[PDB]
Structures are given as C-alpha cells and as structure tokens.
Amino acid sequence: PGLPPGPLENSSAKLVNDEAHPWKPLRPGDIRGPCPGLNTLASHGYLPRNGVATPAQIINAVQEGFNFDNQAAIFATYAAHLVDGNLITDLLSIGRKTRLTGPDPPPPASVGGLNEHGTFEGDASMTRGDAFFGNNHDFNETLFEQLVDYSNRFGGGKYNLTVAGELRFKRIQDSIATNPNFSFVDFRFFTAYGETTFPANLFVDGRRDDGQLDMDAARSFFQFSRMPDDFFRAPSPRSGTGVEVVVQAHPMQPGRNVGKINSYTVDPTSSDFSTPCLMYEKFVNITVKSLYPNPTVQLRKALNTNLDFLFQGVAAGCTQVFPYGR
Ligand code: HEM
Ligand SMILES: *[C@@H]1O[C@H](CO)[C@@H](O)[C@H](O)[C@H]1NC(C)=O
Ligand SMILES: *[C@@H]1O[C@H](CO)[C@@H](O)[C@H](O)[C@H]1NC(C)=O
Ligand SMILES: *[C@@H]1O[C@H](CO)[C@@H](O)[C@H](O)[C@H]1NC(C)=O
Ligand SMILES: *[C@@H]1O[C@H](CO)[C@@H](O)[C@H](O)[C@H]1NC(C)=O
Ligand SMILES: *[C@@H]1O[C@H](CO)[C@@H](O)[C@H](O)[C@H]1NC(C)=O
Ligand SMILES: COc1ccc(CO)cc1OC
Ligand SMILES: [Cl-]
Ligand SMILES: [Mg+2]
Numbered sequence: 001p002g003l004p005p006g007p008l009e010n011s012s013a014k015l016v017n018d019e020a021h022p023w024k025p026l027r028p029g030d031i032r033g034p035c036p037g038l039n040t041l042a043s044h045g046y047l048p049r050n051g052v053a054t055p056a057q058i059i060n061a062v063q064e065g066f067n068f069d070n071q072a073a074i075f076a077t078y079a080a081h082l083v084d085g086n087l088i089t090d091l092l093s094i095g096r097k098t099r100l101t102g103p104d105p106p107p108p109a110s111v112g113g114l115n116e117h118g119t120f121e122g123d124a125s126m127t128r129g130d131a132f133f134g135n136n137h138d139f140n141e142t143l144f145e146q147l148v149d150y151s152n153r154f155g156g157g158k159y160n161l162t163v164a165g166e167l168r169f170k171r172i173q174d175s176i177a178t179n180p181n182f183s184f185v186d187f188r189f190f191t192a193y194g195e196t197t198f199p200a201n202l203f204v205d206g207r208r209d210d211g212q213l214d215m216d217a218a219r220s221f222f223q224f225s226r227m228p229d230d231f232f233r234a235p236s237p238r239s240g241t242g243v244e245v246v247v248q249a250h251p252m253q254p255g256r257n258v259g260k261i262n263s264y265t266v267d268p269t270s271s272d273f274s275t276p277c278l279m280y281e282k283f284v285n286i287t288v289k290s291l292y293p294n295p296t297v298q299l300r301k302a303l304n305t306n307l308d309f310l311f312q313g314v315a316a317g318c319t320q321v322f323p324y325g326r
Contacts, residue, residue: 001090001302002056004078004309007070008063013206013235016065017227021045032225033095033114034121034128034137037198039225041065042094051094052101055081055309058092065233066202072239075313078306079187082288083119086111087302095137105299109291119287122188123179124171126196127222132179139223146170148215158212161242164196165249172252176264182257185270187283189254193247194240201241206232211242247273277318284310289323300324
C-alpha cells in the first residue's frame with residue numbers, strides 16, 4: 001500500500017470541470033455506487049473511470065476535485081477499504097462487488113465494494129433506498145423528488161443545512177415505519193448525519209460557497225455523477241462542517257428496528273456523538289476484526305498497515321487500538 005496523501009499544497013477554489021477532467025458516460029463494466037462524490041470523480045476521470053481505485057487515488061481525487069479535507073478523506077477512505085476493499089491488491093470498488101479487485105480473501109471477509117450493506121453503506125440515505133427494499137446504490141427519483149420538496153419547503157428552493165436537518169429526520173422516520181430491519185447505530189449513525197452536510201459544503205460552487213445548493217446542480221451530481229458546466233470546487237478544505245445544525249434539528253439516539261416496523265429500540269452499547277473514540281474502537285475491534293478474525297501473514301500485515309493509516313484520520317485525543325497486536 002502507498003502512504004496516505006497529505007493535504008493540498010494549494011487549496012484555493014478553481015475550475016475542476018476542466019479540459020483534463022471531462023464528464024463521460026458509463027461504458028459497459030464501469031462501476032458506480034451509493035456515493036455521488038466518488039461517482040462524480042470517476043465520471044470526470046479524477047478516479048479511474050471504471051470505478052475501481054486505490055485508497056491513495058481516492059484521497060487525492062476527493063481533495064483535488066472537491067477540496068475534501070485530509071483528515072476526513074483519510075478516515076473515510078481507509079474505513080471503506082478495510083471493510084469493502086481488497087487489502088492485498090490495494091483496490092476498492094466504489095460500487096458493486098467485482099473480480100477487478102483481485103483474488104478474494106477467505107470468508108467471512110466479503111470485499112463487496114461500497115455497495116456492501118452494513119459495513120460502510122447503510123439505511124436512511126437521502127437519494128438511495130434502504131438495502132431491504134432491493135437496491136442500496138442506484139439513484140432513486142422518488143427520493144430525489146422528496147429532497148426537492150424539502151428544499152422548496154425549508155430552503156427557499158435550495159438545499160441547505162436547514163433542509164438537511166429536516167430531511168435527515170424524515171428519512172429516519174420513513175425507515176422506522178417501513179423497514180423492519182432498519183439499523184441506525186455506530187458507524188452508520190455518524191455517517192448518516194455528516195453525509196447530509198456534504199451537498200451544502202462541497203457541491204456548491206466555490207466562488208459562492210454560501211451553503212445553498214440549487215436543484216439543477218443537485219440532480220447533476222446525485223443522478224448523473226456530473227459537475228455543472230464551469231464548476232469551481234470549494235475555496236478551502238472541508239467535509240462535515242455544520243453537522244451540528246442537522247443534529248440539533250431533531251436529536252436522535254442510535255438504535256434499530258427489532259424485526260418489525262415501528263419497533264425502534266435504542267442500543268446503549270452503540271457509540272453516539274458523546275463517544276466518538278468508541279465509534280473508532282468498535283469499528284476496529286468488532287467490524288474489521290469480524291471480517292478478518294484470524295488472518296494469514298500477508299493479510300495481517302496489510303490489515304495493520306491500513307489500520308495505522310485509518311488512525312491518522314481519527315480526531316486527536318483517541319487512543320489507537322491494536323486488534324492483531326503491534
Ligand atoms: C472520501 C472518500 C469517500 C468515500 C469512501 C465515500 C463513500 C460513501 C458511501 C459508501 C456512502 C453511502 C452512505 C449511505 O448509506 O448513505 C456515501 C454517502 C455520501 N457521500 Fe460519500 N464518500 C466519500 C467522500 C465523499 C465526498 C468527497 C462527497 C462529496 C464531494 C461525498 C458525498 C456523499 C453524499 C452526498 C452521500 C449521501 C448520498 C445519499 O444519501 O443519497 N462523499 N459516501
Ligand atoms: C493557488 O491556485 C490559485 C487558483 O488556481 C492561484 O490563483 C494561486 O495564485 C495559487 N497560489 C500559489 C501560491 O501559487
Ligand atoms: C439486516 O440487518 C442486519 C444487521 O442488523 C444486516 O447484517 C443485514 O445485512 C440487513 N439486511 C438488509 C437487507 O437490510
Ligand atoms: C424508489 O424509492 C421509492 C420510495 O421509497 C420506492 O417506492 C421505489 O420502489 C424506489 N425504486 C424505484 C426504482 O423507484
Ligand atoms: C435555508 O434556506 C432558508 C430559506 O432561504 C433559510 O430560512 C435558512 O436560514 C437557510 N438555512 C441555512 C443553514 O442556510
Ligand atoms: C478494543 O480492543 C482493545 C484491545 O486490543 C481494548 O483496549 C479496547 O478497550 C477495546 N475497545 C472496545 C470498545 O471494545
Ligand atoms: C468525513 O467523513 C465521511 C466521509 C465520507 C462519508 C461518506 O460520504 C461519510 C463521512 O462521515 C460523515
Ligand atoms: Cl486538508
Ligand atoms: Mg444507504
């Protein structure tokens with residue numbers, strides 16, 4: 001594995017929909033998944049256009065194309081790679097499972113790409129349906145139209161953090177009401193909130209950076225993986241700033257439905273926003289370790305390297321944990 005890239009040398013706003021990075025349609029075999037950011041980077045050639053990439057390629061692409069901040073890029077990328085990528089070949093699919101990531105490790109590891117439900121991807125996404133309903137990765141028009149409606153109602157026709165706060169809660173309540181397997185704990189509990197800020201922070205043209213995303217731009221990213229014509233990236237590195245507004249709108253406890261609709265039951269063993277270090281510790285000790293309980297020599301080495309890289313993205317104050325020793 002390569003070292004995690006460092007922050008941008010020059011993080012100014014600039015044209016990112018440029019001559020070197022044109023949008024192109026999908027070819028047969030090209031993979032897109034549940035993340036409109038990575039999808040857009042692949043469809044503009046910031047990532048390989050087939051949607052299979054190394055962690056270093058992903059980190060460079062999110063920084064260069066969108067000004068995603070370095071710490072956030074490192075944590076997300078290595079978390080995804082650990083649970084969804086091939087640690088020997090150093091390749092991760094941004095969507096469905098593919099033979100392009102190379103020879104698989106033994107069960108119970110899945111190397112399922114970002115489409116793998118319950119590892120990184122989870123329920124109550126804004127524009128993708130819950131995995132229980134049959135498709136956790138494709139753009140959903142009905143859900144996008146709901147995003148438009150919430151933008152009309154709470155954002156004057158634009159998507160902003162106020163809209164995010166209301167839509168985040170709506171999606172949770174809809175999953176509680178209809179998905180008997182709804183899960184909203186630990187890693188998904190965190191990412192579900194942060195992801196709702198990303199359209200306001202990163203899909204807004206960086207010459208404005210006003211947190212007000214228009215619906216034409218929103219559809220372009222969410223549906224077509226396409227930057228608006230003349231799109232400038234954000235003017236400074238960021239990811240989840242303003243997530244507090246989203247949480248404050250409708251504070252929730254982590255929990256799950258318990259095999260029936262309308263049975264949301266709080267999980268006191270889950271991390272929440274009061275215990276961010278616990279979220280990291282459980283991700284490593286439980287989630288990663290369960291996929292690789294007794295790895296062979298070359299896998300153990302790759303796990304430890306990628307776990308070291310993951311820890312670079314963890315907020316200062318947390319203690320590193322070592323599931324396979326040092
Ligand atoms: C840094 C590497 C990144 C990885 C590995 C990644 C991966 C993912 C995954 C797997 C999801 C699905 C979560 C869910 O179940 O809803 C997701 C959600 C999302 N990501 Fe990313 N992401 C990354 C960075 C970014 C960036 C830079 C952007 C924007 C520039 C972005 C925008 C989004 C949005 C908007 C969603 C929610 C989509 C929806 O709910 O419809 N992500 N990401
Ligand atoms: C950084 O990039 C911007 C936009 O491309 C440019 O205007 C600026 O002068 C660059 N800064 C340095 C120090 O080169
Ligand atoms: C149902 O929930 C469990 C974990 O609570 C998860 O392993 C499983 O993949 C879920 N499946 C769907 C389709 O939601
Ligand atoms: C999209 O989401 C809606 C609302 O949850 C759902 O009823 C529909 O089956 C989903 N799929 C498609 C292909 O529209
Ligand atoms: C969202 O837009 C609405 C209408 O313009 C406005 O009242 C609200 O303050 C905005 N919220 C943010 C966080 O910009
Ligand atoms: C994770 O495992 C380490 C031992 O490697 C231990 O110190 C730590 O308390 C564990 N944390 C959790 C949340 O299980
Ligand atoms: C910055 O942390 C994240 C990076 C990527 C995703 C998925 O788009 C979720 C994150 O946590 C909010
Ligand atoms: Cl940064
Ligand atoms: Mg999802």
